[PDB]
Amino acid sequence: MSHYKSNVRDQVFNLFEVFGVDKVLGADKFSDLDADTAREMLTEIARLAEGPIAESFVEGDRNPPVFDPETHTVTLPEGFKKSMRALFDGGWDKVGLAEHLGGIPMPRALQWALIEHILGANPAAYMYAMGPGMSEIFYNNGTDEQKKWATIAAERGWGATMVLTEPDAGSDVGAGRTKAVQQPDGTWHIEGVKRFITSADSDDLFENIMHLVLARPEGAGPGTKGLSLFFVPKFHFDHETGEIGERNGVFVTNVEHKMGLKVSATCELSLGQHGIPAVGWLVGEVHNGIAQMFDVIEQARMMVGTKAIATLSTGYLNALEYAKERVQGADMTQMTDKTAPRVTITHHPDVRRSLMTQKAYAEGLRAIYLYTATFQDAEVAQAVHGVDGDLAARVNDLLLPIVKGFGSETAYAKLTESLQTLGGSGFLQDYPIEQYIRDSKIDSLYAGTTAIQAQDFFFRKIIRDKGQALAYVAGEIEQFIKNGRLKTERELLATALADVQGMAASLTGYLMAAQEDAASIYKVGLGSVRFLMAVGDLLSGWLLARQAAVAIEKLDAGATGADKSFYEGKIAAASFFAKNMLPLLTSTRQIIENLDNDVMELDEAAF
Residue (310 or 437) nearer to its own copies, CB: 437
**Choice from 314, 421, 453, 506 touching ligand FAD (CB under 6 A):** 421
Span of 19-27, 160-168, 184-192, 305-313 interacting with ligand FAD by CB under 6 A: 160-168
| Contact string 353-392 vs ligand FAD (x = CB under 6 A) | ----------------------------------------
Indicate whether 71 belongs to the interface with ligand FAD (CB under 6 A).
Answer: no
In the complex, minimum distance from the CB of residue 485 to its own copies, in angstroms, rounded to a whole number: 12
| C-alpha to C-alpha distance for 406 and 409, rounded to whole angstroms | 5
Indicate whether 328 belongs to the interface with ligand FAD (CB under 6 A).
Answer: yes
**Choice from 31, 171, 183, 488 touching ligand FAD (CB under 6 A):** 171
Interaction residues for ligand FAD, span 507-546 (CB under 6 A): none
In the complex, minimum distance from the CB of residue 231 to its own copies, in angstroms, rounded to a whole number: 25
| C-alpha to C-alpha distance for 564 and 266, rounded to whole angstroms | 46
CA–CA–CA angle 281, 148, 29 (5° rounding): 120
Residue (160 or 419) nearer to its own copies, CB: 419
| C-alpha to C-alpha distance for 564 and 179, rounded to whole angstroms | 61
Indicate whether 408 belongs to the interface with ligand FAD (CB under 6 A).
Answer: no
Residue (557 or 606) nearer to its own copies, CB: 606
In the complex, minimum distance from the CB of residue 468 to ligand FAD, in angstroms, rounded to a whole number: 25
Span of 33-41, 165-173, 544-552, 582-590 interacting with ligand FAD by CB under 6 A: 165-173
In the complex, minimum distance from the CB of residue 60 to ligand FAD, in angstroms, rounded to a whole number: 14
The answer to whether 479 touches 545, Cβ cutoff 8 Å, is no
| C-alpha to C-alpha distance for 349 and 448, rounded to whole angstroms | 38
Residue (20 or 223) nearer to its own copies, CB: 223
Going from the C-alpha of 447 to that of each of 161, 264, 404, 453, 456, the distances in angstroms are 13, 15, 8, 9, 12
Indicate whether 424 belongs to the interface with ligand FAD (CB under 6 A).
Answer: yes
**Choice from 164, 317, 492, 539 touching ligand FAD (CB under 6 A):** 164
Span of 27-35, 326-334, 376-384, 495-503 interacting with ligand FAD by CB under 6 A: 326-334
The answer to whether 96 touches 106, Cβ cutoff 8 Å, is yes
164 binds, among ligand FAD, its own copies, none (CB under 5 to 8 A by kind): ligand FAD
Question: Backbone phi, then psi, for 288, in 5-degree steps?
Answer: -155, 50
In the complex, minimum distance from the CB of residue 162 to ligand FAD, in angstroms, rounded to a whole number: 5
**Choice from 266, 374, 418, 506 touching ligand FAD (CB under 6 A):** 266
Helix (H/G/I), strand (E/B), else coil: 179:
strand
Residue (244 or 445) nearer to ligand FAD, CB: 445
| Contact string 451-470 vs ligand FAD (x = CB under 6 A) | xx------------------
Indicate whether 345 belongs to the interface with ligand FAD (CB under 6 A).
Answer: yes
How are beta strands 209-217 and 179-182 bridged, if at all? Answer: parallel
517-536 as b/e: b if 16+ CB within 10 A: eeebbbbbbbbbbbbbbbbb
Indicate whether 67 belongs to the interface with ligand FAD (CB under 6 A).
Answer: no
Residue (264 or 372) nearer to its own copies, CB: 264
Span of 22-30, 83-91, 157-165, 549-557 interacting with ligand FAD by CB under 6 A: 157-165
How are beta strands 73-75 and 159-163 bridged, if at all? Answer: unpaired
162 binds, among its own copies, ligand FAD, none (CB under 5 to 8 A by kind): ligand FAD
Residue (332 or 505) nearer to its own copies, CB: 332
Residue (146 or 311) nearer to its own copies, CB: 311
DSSP structure string for 548-578:
HHHHHHHHHTT--HHHHHHHHHHHHHHHHHH
Indicate whether 255 belongs to the interface with ligand FAD (CB under 6 A).
Answer: no
DSSP structure string for 228-243:
EEEEEESEEE-TTT--
Indicate whether 137 belongs to the interface with ligand FAD (CB under 6 A).
Answer: no
| C-alpha to C-alpha distance for 598 and 43, rounded to whole angstroms | 55
Contacts of 290 (CB under 8 A, 6+ apart): 173, 174, 214, 224, 225, 227
| C-alpha to C-alpha distance for 176 and 170, rounded to whole angstroms | 8
Indicate whether 555 belongs to the interface with ligand FAD (CB under 6 A).
Answer: no
Helix (H/G/I), strand (E/B), else coil: 170:
coil
Residue (231 or 446) nearer to ligand FAD, CB: 446
Indicate whether 315 belongs to the interface with ligand FAD (CB under 6 A).
Answer: no
| C-alpha to C-alpha distance for 593 and 505, rounded to whole angstroms | 9
In the complex, minimum distance from the CB of residue 114 to ligand FAD, in angstroms, rounded to a whole number: 22
In the complex, minimum distance from the CB of residue 384 to its own copies, in angstroms, rounded to a whole number: 27
Among residues 283, 314, 332, 304, the alpha carbon closest in space to that of 403 is found at: 304
479 binds, among ligand FAD, its own copies, none (CB under 5 to 8 A by kind): none
Residues in the chain: 607
| Chain residue at closest Cβ approach to ligand FAD | 170
| C-alpha to C-alpha distance for 381 and 24, rounded to whole angstroms | 10
In the complex, minimum distance from the CB of residue 266 to ligand FAD, in angstroms, rounded to a whole number: 5
Q: Is the dihedral of CA 175, 297, 261, 361 positive or negative?
A: positive
Indicate whether 337 belongs to the interface with ligand FAD (CB under 6 A).
Answer: no
DSSP structure string for 324-384:
HH-EEEE-GGGTT-TTSPEEEGGGSHHHHHHHHHHHHHHHHHHHHHHHHHTTSSHHHHHHH
Query: How far separated are the first and last CA of the chain, in Å rounded?
Result: 50
381 binds, among its own copies, ligand FAD, none (CB under 5 to 8 A by kind): none
Residues engaged in binding ligand FAD (CB under 6 A): 161-165, 170-171, 196-198, 258, 261, 266, 326, 328-329, 345, 348, 350-351, 420-421, 423-425, 427, 442, 445-449, 451-452
